[PDB]
Design a protein around this ligand. Structure first.
Ligand SMILES: [Ca+2]
Ligand SMILES: [Ca+2]
Length: 673
């Protein structure tokens, strides 16, 4: 159904002005007018492909007077020819007719066998041309200019084309739907493993991201590891003979973010934050809790998933990951067995899938290496409550389209490691956080003025890149991402990119980038980082806070209040930058009673299934509503942002909230509750 002969239909008599490129599954090579105005008249056509059958055959068409046909460079129409089973023969057909009186083309290709049965050639017999960068049994190729052999004529790639689905196939036509342009000299304009033609005609792995079906958007995996929770325990040692002692482990939830530190690194990394909120009774040190003496060792287990935030899937190799304490203390290497993956790792997805159990670093597996820390490393983890996961870019084999059989299959001859460098060298990179404040990278084909091949690509503007790579749209004068104007996001660039864009702005006599996005041209190797302006970002470009005015405004909508808590509607992005809340009762003279007065007791908010947030005053008040002794006392509630969050007791041991920088978000007298 994606298989057959490939046809080019031209409005002129001499194969210069292709109006339609499309394939036919059978010898019926017609395009009726209903699938198509002054240029619906076709004066020439070329069809290309292969035939596979053992007999003497006679070829004929419905217009033999206007046709030349070759079977492997032997002219068969301008004859019984012998064809053998199990063999592939090249087919080329040319058709020319001056001043046709009907629109479209009625054209059929027949053959007659030695029992004199004549019929339109069936689908089982016809195959597409080998539109690849190398020949396979099937070579590549009255020549349509097609310098890169992807199947799209030079002129269309340069001038602009559209693809439309008509019944059961794709018509590729000149632009007068999405307007495509691509390099006529790059089989894959994004330097990825899928051709410009494969992409736009759907002859491609169904798991490739929708946006990466544009020839100007790169299709490649981007993988990091998400750690969901951790369990720490004292290692057994040769000196301790008895193993029957009580459970003394520390179990914590963890939050992991993919990071970016703009920059030039194509490295994968994620940073893990270990929850500091109360989980065990007492206020013990981690050593005290687990009974670690100064000569003991501890180990760590965790649950993880791999995340693919890129645009193409992985099939047979997961990348290797280092788990790192502090700057460079590697605690573990995490690997998966090659060629034994339980599933695909698709774009915008996880491995294992979220409907399945995550992976335990030490699986309930005789050979799993313990993830051990010495005593000083353990104390460092307790202090920092951070780990890092550095993942390589080793992604294995690629599922490619095969023109012989019209199937996509993992090709042991094709490997992501042969493609990534060229993608990185020839594209502009944009990292955007508009999807839930998580950093998502895309790469867009962009000219490199210094590399002659890369100058054969279309100009990529900043506006178009944002539209095609991230789905920005323009409904009514103004570029937007899911309702949010582009002006709600900032632009940051690496040093070279910044100078380039500065010089462009100067050349345009433009002082504001947001009003000339359609005029700013991207170049290969640019790095652009675009972040939601509402937020404060750490050195990893993780959102960790927001200005007080933003935070206050975000808590203005109170549904209900009582001595039990607050019920509010709070934007999802704002919730992401808080560690918790502090509740206080303020008496008439201005003295304050802090109710949950501990750095590990701020986790009092929860998101209900109706999407509203409840801030629970009872949780750390011994399960009791607030006692307000005089109705003129105030109940004050403060938000604590991540960047302001205390994760350890103070140097002198104080576990209270004294001196924590907090933002007042609710204040009402007792009689107002
Ligand atoms: Ca081409
Ligand atoms: Ca091309």
């Amino acid at each position: 159904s994606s298989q057959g002969l490939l046809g080019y239909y031209f409005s002129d008599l001499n194969f210069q002005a292709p109006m339609v490129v499309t394939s036919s599954t059978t010898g019926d090579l017609s395009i009726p007018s209903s699938e198509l105005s002054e240029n619906q008249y076709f004066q020439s056509a070329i069809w290309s492909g292969f035939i596979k059958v053992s007999d003497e055959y006679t070829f004929a068409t419905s217009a033999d007077n206007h046709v030349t046909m070759w079977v492997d460079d032997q002219e068969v129409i301008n004859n019984k020819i012998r064809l053998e089973k199990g063999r592939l023969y090249q087919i080329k057909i040319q058709y020319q007719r001056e001043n046709p009186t009907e629109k479209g083309l009625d054209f059929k290709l027949y053959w007659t066998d030695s029992q004199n049965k004549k019929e339109v050639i069936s689908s089982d017999n016809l195959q597409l041309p080998e539109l690849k960068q190398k020949s396979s049994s099937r070579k590549k190729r009255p020549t349509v200019p097609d310098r890169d052999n992807d199947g799209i004529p030079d002129s269309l790639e340069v001038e602009g084309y559209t693809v439309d689905v008509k019944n059961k196939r794709t018509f590729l036509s000149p632009w007068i739907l999405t307007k495509y342009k691509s390099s006529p000299e790059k089989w894959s304009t994004a330097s990825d493993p899928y051709s410009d033609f494969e992409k736009v005609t759907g002859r491609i792995d169904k798991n490739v991201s929708p946006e990466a079906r544009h020839p100007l958007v790169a299709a490649y995996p981007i993988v990091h590891v998400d750690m969901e929770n951790i369990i720490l325990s004292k290692n057994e040692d040769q000196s301790t003979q008895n193993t029957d002692s009580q459970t003394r482990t520390i179990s914590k939830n963890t939050s992991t973010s993919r990071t970016h530190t703009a920059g030039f690194s194509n490295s994968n990394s994620s940073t893990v934050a270990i929850d500091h909120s109360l989980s065990l009774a007492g206020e013990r040190t981690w050593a005290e809790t687990m009974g670690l003496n100064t000569a003991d060792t501890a180990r760590l287990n965790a649950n993880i998933r791999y995340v693919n935030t890129g645009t193409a899937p992985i099939y047979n190799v997961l990348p290797t990951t280092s788990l790192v304490l502090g700057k460079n203390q590697t605690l573990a290497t995490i690997k998966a067995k090659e060629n034994q993956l339980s599933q695909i790792l698709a774009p915008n997805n996880y491995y294992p899938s979220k409907n399945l159990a995550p992976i335990a670093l030490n699986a309930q597996d005789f050979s799993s290496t313990p993830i051990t820390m010495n005593y000083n490393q353990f104390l460092e983890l307790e202090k920092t409550k951070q780990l890092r996961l550095d993942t390589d870019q080793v992604y294995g084999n690629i599922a490619t389209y095969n023109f012989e059989n019209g199937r996509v299959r993992v090709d042991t001859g094709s490997n992501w490691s042969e493609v990534l460098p060229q993608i990185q060298e020839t594209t502009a990179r944009i990292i955007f956080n508009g999807k839930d404040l998580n950093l998502v990278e895309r790469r867009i084909a962009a000219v490199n003025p210094s590399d002659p091949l890369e100058t054969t690509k279309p100009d990529m503007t900043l506006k178009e890149a944002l539209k095609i790579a991230f789905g920005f749209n323009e409904p009514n004068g103004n570029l937007q991402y899911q309702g949010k104007d582009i002006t709600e996001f900032d632009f940051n660039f690496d040093q070279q990119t910044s100078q380039n864009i500065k010089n462009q702005l100067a050349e345009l006599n433009a002082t504001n980038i947001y009003t000339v996005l359609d005029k700013i041209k991207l170049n290969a190797k640019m790095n652009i980082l675009i972040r939601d302006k509402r937020f404060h970002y750490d050195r990893n470009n993780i959102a960790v806070g927001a200005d007080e005015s933003v935070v206050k405004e975000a808590h203005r909508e109170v549904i209900n209040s009582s001595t039990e808590g607050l019920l509010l509607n709070i934007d999802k992005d704002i919730r992401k930058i808080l560690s918790g809340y502090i509740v206080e009762i303020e008496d008439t003279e201005g003295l304050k009673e802090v109710i949950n007065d501990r750095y590990d007791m701020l986790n009092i908010s929860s998101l209900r299934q109706d999407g509203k947030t409840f801030i629970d005053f009872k949780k750390y008040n011994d399960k009791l509503p607030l006692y307000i002794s005089n109705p003129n006392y105030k109940v004050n509630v403060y938000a604590v942002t991540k960047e302001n969050t205390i994760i350890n007791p103070s140097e002198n041991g104080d576990t209270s909230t004294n001196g924590i920088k907090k933002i007042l978000i609710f204040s009402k007298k007792g009689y107002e509750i």
